[PDB]
Symmetry: D3
């Protein structure tokens, strides 16, 4: 077997990828999302009740479908990053990255020694298909995609420095965390927040990195796509489930 | 503690109850449905990948919310009915009931000896809250609601006989199974099928039983409600999740 | 490896075995019970929310301890009996046995062909330790113990006939089901019920079979032990947990 | 989406398919087996500790790989067959089939009304991908493959009658159950048993049905492949795991 | 929907709340505890085998009952505190707090930006009921209760400084950890340890904070209640289960 | 009950112990490994998809068998070490130890106060069997075995310093991580790497500590045993499962 090609990683340079957030924390719900045809699915280990084992179940469900899996760990924890890479997550989204030094450490966390600090356990890893991918330890690093989130004032205060880090493939703006950080909690739609988001997208793309964002607002999502934003999540499974069931009940009250 | 009042059962005689089918087979997904405000939730043990333990988890999630839980077992199996009653399911929907004899056995399956054949295990049962409901063995039978499905030609061939069974609280029409039985598989909307459904509803209510049905078609659901149908399920969580995610992706393709 | 010796089975002829009912349906709770020193633990697949997989977890927990595991299936279902024997349950308690014909079928369900109808899958079974017990298919039948429950009027109406079945090692009286059957639901303590239980124990022992019963009442349990009852369960984990926590709260209200 | 093509079913007429038995009852272990390159994987719900939910997890793991999933239910139970088809099992192996009447009922259990008795729940089923396979109710029946086991004297006594049942795609011989039935428990290698197996294979193929068998014996398996046997399982994951670990330890003792 | 009112938090100023430690790590066992009528239940993520997903299951069980849930994480880990708040834990007990600086960081960990560092993910959170609590991001902070444990010499060495931290609602004394720290491991009953505990309680209440403690000793628990201790846990489910089963067996030996 | 004797720990001074790596992350697979007769089983929480709860299930499976359980946490995290000791892991293997300061902290993480920093929760711990081991808090420390991994240049740069730490019972060499660290990723067999491993083993044994290693290469493993290496893992369950299935398929292709 040859290593799984990371099409998400390649498509950062060639197209705009439409994403769905997956917080239902369940292999069965993840498979339903995998059938729709999203370019990427975000398995949320930060804000949904997920652990390594539930994330593995969702990777296994999604793997039969063309949608590319991206995993958000709860934090930029080097040992957790090791665990998520070994279960075979090829794209990681690190929350709350605030410095070049942190971004460099996240790069190393995703690469084998001697260049990085990724723990070696190829005989045990779904990532190597338990060494059925015979050249995994040579071919792994190339199909790993590192995304970091800028979603705090300190993040914005270190944006130029993070954008200068070789090995950061993309910067994702988190509007919920960023609008709260800016003193507009629950109101990312405010012009003060939006002007910062647009300037941030422009600076990310100007530095040759992929820009990413989530908006459940169709107008904002289409505006971000018009700016050339490379990876745009357009909804959340928990949100769509709740809203679809409420909208239906409202017809009958 | 006093036994949990079965409001679904009482409301069969006082109002029209709006239902949501729950086939996501997950305590977390069931809790999302429970927040919406449906009169009843159908935990599907027949057509969703559920067992006694996953059904228990969903009952525990839903229990904090006003929505009344109804459980469909895979078949009219007396031992399985015993298991679902002891985990505290107070309303059962029995699929594919086809005779007065089978309906009578389902009545007995829901009632303690000597009048019924429900196995006695109150010290172990969530139903009795492990005997914290001190008079459970005396008060149980009154808060148990038996619904049976007519969804085959043999069912329709025995409808008057089933409607004469004391202890059957409601007859639910399954349009998917019934339309397939009638040689219109996937096409319940056909006049031939609809005329049989309307006459069946009329006969059920004429005999003093509650009538029920599921349609994801808003016009059909509102038509069934105009006929006085007592319990109408208006959607399915798997369907709404899939449809909401597809409709969203179609705005971006 | 040699087959696990069924000490419960042997001790039916040599001593009185004190039992604990295990309905917490959890490998961790079962291990707590296993540390106490009961002669036997009843893993209840009839009245606790258990399935083959949760019963396997509890067998694995209990296996490191001297307490002997007995499993109650939800009913006398031949295929379920096959499944519980293969995960390595060596003693079964069949509920609601009502005839010699049913008891004979339960005997066959526990024995390999050509004498019985137990399905053969030794390469897959924890029971054979995946054939690490090299002579399992020759030594299995001898360490299997069959117990049947008499707990209905029809059971009592066929008692002499069931006691004449070779391969029934013990008859267990279920006071909850039997008192309900007799029209004293929730009141097995009534003299009418107790006189039948005592006569039933005497007849079981007179026929050379082991007699068994459960009573959470210390006086009744000691009375049954004074009659020579061979296997007596003296409590239920769910009951003891609820009562211990209520008794403690009552000191502080 | 178009219905998943059942290549196992097609290949019954065009080649000899090599199989691996999957009794580790685990989505993670099933994925390891899926990477090897077997033509088919048997998810054993009869002799391994599986239920609908653990079988679903293994179907989801295997689905990303070319290996074709076959599911063995614990018995020819119509409602369980319904449950396994809806989670998306396209080939079923029914144990201990003993008459044309039973084989005919298993055919009906796999087909939608009005021709069969398969319960209709396409909105809830992974099988239809929750109706994302838009024509599922019209295209389902064609991609369903029914295999029945002859593994008892009564099965052999009804072989010609079973082979005359339209809708039985294949007859699998179970050497463990059959050798036990014949009074050679644990010793299927005996000439008495082998002569019956060879004649049975010849009779199956003469009637235009696919023949199947399992043997962990390389010589027997190759002899069966030489006879033209269409589906041959050549090992068992539990057996291979145990033997590989034993053989390794023996080098160091 | 309005945010769940934290009655535990309000009752810190109005009454003495009686608690039960829940370490059986199981939604089913947590529901048994929830039926008893304790003012609060401690779901132990530090010393019972719990993770975010098992803690979620226990919150869902308890939510139908008046008992207030408190969650102890394994340590004062900011990302884990984020995870436990989003699954809807409204009161946290932080183990081994040893400085004002650590206590201040725990305050921030429980509050949204810009005032705190709690990660924002309201669309995914059971805490917000997936935004069905429409003003959650404005009303959340007020119903969150922070408790910290003083249970080391360094804790006692920084007690006045911790008691001066705005946002610490209560200080809980851990007698097991504290007695071990003081060189009296397993012997918290010693006068040396008790005099420190009493003075510590007096200082906590003198600073206007709620004091808390656990003792399975009825006399010590009643002494702590006589001192005005606001939240007193009086037992542990694992302890009561083990003790109740041992005491019962001792009557029969 | 008396504390479980750590025979692995005793045997570090008296014999050479043969080990099997357990990465199938499953109570059922762990039991299969436990039946083989390995001196020790490594439950891998670093490179297999395990958490505290799945590790507990595997400890419970293994506990009925003579094989000694060793647990590798994902990192030298003090709170995780606390959690793994309380579920009853008596031997820990800490990955990537790189200084005497870190080794000293790992020693303290395994010992109760006042000498160590292990959190006290004996009432809740399987380790104390919920205090059924009456003297646990006095006898615990003696049956705990600390192993540390040297598998980086910084580890080798601090080897003499680590070997001088009282309370480190053994140093395990990780050839995968070490060969990668040395710029021979995937090629530990190279003479440059092997000469370092041999000198490292000699230095470990010269300092009076137990030396450990894993090699799936029979020749290398036997060479290490010839050097006097005290604990040698000779294979990996995931590797043996994959290879056994591949080698079998290759006979039929
Ligand atoms: O927006 C953010 O802050 C995020 O990083 C995650 C959110 O959960 C996501 O955008 C959904 O609103
Ligand atoms: O319609 C039926 O046949 C049913 O009984 C159940 C179906 O799954 C339900 O109606 C959803 O279409
Ligand atoms: O008493 C019975 O009827 C039983 O067979 C089972 C009961 O659950 C048990 O005795 C506990 O009351
Ligand atoms: O051989 C049989 O009887 C079977 O049907 C199943 C067995 O488990 C299989 O052949 C493995 O020995
Ligand atoms: O006492 C302590 O140290 C605690 O913080 C927790 C203990 O597990 C609890 O008190 C039970 O003894
Ligand atoms: O070798 C190492 O680096 C290890 O520490 C763990 C590996 O997973 C093990 O050796 C199997 O190759
Ligand atoms: Ca199950
Ligand atoms: Ca987990
Ligand atoms: Zn964010
Ligand atoms: Zn139906
Ligand atoms: Zn009974
Ligand atoms: Zn068979
Ligand atoms: Zn403590
Ligand atoms: Zn390593």
């Amino acid at each position: 077997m040859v290593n799984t090609v990371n099409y998400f990683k390649q498509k950062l340079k060639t197209e705009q990828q439409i994403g769905m957030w997956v917080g239902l924390a369940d292999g069965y719900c993840a498979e339903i999302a995998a059938n729709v045809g999203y370019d990427w699915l975000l398995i949320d280990g930060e804000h949904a009740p997920n652990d390594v084992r539930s994330i593995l179940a969702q990777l296994q469900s999604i793997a039969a479908y063309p949608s590319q899996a991206v995993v958000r760990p709860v934090s930029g924890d080097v040992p957790l990053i090791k665990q998520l890479l070994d279960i075979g997550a090829q794209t990681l989204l690190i929350p709350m990255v605030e410095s070049a030094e942190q971004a460099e450490l996240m790069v190393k966390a995703t690469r084998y020694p001697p260049e990085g600090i990724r723990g070696v356990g190829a005989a045990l890893a779904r990532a190597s298909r338990w060494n059925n991918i015979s050249d995994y330890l040579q071919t792994a690093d190339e199909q790993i995609c590192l995304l970091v989130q800028v979603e705090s004032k300190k993040g914005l205060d270190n944006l130029d420095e993070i954008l200068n880090v070789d090995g950061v493939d993309g910067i994702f703006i988190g509007p919920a965390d960023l609008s709260a950080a800016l003193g507009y909690r629950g109101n990312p739609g405010h012009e003060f927040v939006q002007n910062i988001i647009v300037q941030t997208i422009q600076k990310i793309r100007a530095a040759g990195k992929a820009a990413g964002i989530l908006s459940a607002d169709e107008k904002l999502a289409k505006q971000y796509l018009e700016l050339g934003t490379e990876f745009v999540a357009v909804g959340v499974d928990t949100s769509l489930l709740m809203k679809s069931m409420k909208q239906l009940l409202s017809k009958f009250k």
